[PDB]
Amino acid sequence: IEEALQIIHS
Amino acid sequence: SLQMIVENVKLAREYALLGNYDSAMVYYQGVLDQMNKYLYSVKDTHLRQKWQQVWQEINVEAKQVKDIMKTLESFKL
Amino acid sequence: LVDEDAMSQIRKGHDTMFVVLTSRHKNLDTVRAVWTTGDIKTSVDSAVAINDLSVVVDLLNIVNQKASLWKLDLCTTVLPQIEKLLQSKYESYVQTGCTSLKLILQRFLPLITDILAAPPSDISREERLHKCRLCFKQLKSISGLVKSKSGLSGRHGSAFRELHLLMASL
Numbered sequence: 373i374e375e376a377l378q379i380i381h382s
Numbered sequence: 383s384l385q386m387i388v389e390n391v392k393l394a395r396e397y398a399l400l401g402n403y404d405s406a407m408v409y410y411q412g413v414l415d416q417m418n419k420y421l422y423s424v425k426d427t428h429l430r431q432k433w434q435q436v437w438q439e440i441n442v443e444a445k446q447v448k449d450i451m452k453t454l455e456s457f458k459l
Numbered sequence: 460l461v462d463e464d465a466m467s468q469i470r471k472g473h474d475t476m477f478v479v480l481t482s483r484h485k486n487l488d489t490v491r492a493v494w495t496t497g498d499i500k501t502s503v504d505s506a507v508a509i510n511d512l513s514v515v516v517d518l519l520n521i522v523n524q525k526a527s528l529w530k531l532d533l534c535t536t537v538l539p540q541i542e543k544l545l546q547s548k549y550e551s552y553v554q555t556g557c558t559s560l561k562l563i564l565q566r567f568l569p570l571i572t573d574i575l576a577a578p579p580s581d582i583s584r585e586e587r588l589h590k591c592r593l594c595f596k597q598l599k600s601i602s603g604l605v606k607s608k609s610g611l612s613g614r615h616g617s618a619f620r621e622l623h624l625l626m627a628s629l
Contacts, residue, residue, distance in 0.1 A: 373399045373513055373549075376479050380395045380472045384465040391469050395476050400551055401516050429462060436466050439473045446480035453487050454517060457494055459525045 410444035538597035557618040564625040
């Protein structure tokens with residue numbers, strides 16, 4: 373889920 | 383507060399990504415309600431249509447969370 | 460904050476969320492299709508085959524609620540996943556990993572210890588003995604990770620202090 377989390381974080 | 387709406391979408395999504403579906407649904411239903419209330423304070427027709435589009439996208443995500451929870455609940459012990 | 464900007468910020472992550480969530484839903488349905496309390500290892504195995512740790516986490520959060528469903532053979536499948544979870548940077552993954560490991564230790568460590576200590580004596584029994592040796596190897600490896608995290612809470616309690624005490628015999 374890390375990639376998705378960074379997308380959502382940005 | 384639009385910033386509050388943006389923040390609550392972010393939290394709903396993070397909780398869903400992390401598998402905390404109970405909390406995700408609190409934020410998803412809360413922000414759908416926040417947006418709907420805000421939507422109808424908007425007088426410009428196209429801006430309201432644009433917010434309704436966003437609301438529908440969030441609703442899609444929330445419905446996916448609800449489906450995941452229904453599946454998980456179906457695991458009887 | 461202007462409406463257009465707020466909408467833009469929200470919509471950016473929508474396709475990502477739709478893809479991730481529909482993929483997780485499908486994967487969980489696959490796991491569910493082989494579910495039976497009579498042998499929960501079958502669903503755990505499917506989750507491990509799908510190779511998505513988020514699906515393993517969701518399944519462990521379910522089966523961690525009833526230890527009676529766990530059998531010795533399930534341990535050698537779950538322990539490698541526990542090892543991954545205890546190293547996660549997500550607190551909630553670490554906690555699921557801790558919960559499962561405490562379950563295993565409290566349910567199985569005496570039995571594993573007894574079998575391994577027994578005087579030498581049957582294919583089934585010999586398979587079980589090799590399962591026990593593998594569990595011990597896996598638990599011994601996990602204990603070092605646990606020992607490296609048991610002091611993080613200082614004077615306070617923590618799930619890793621509990622596990623270190625539960626693993627004192629190793």
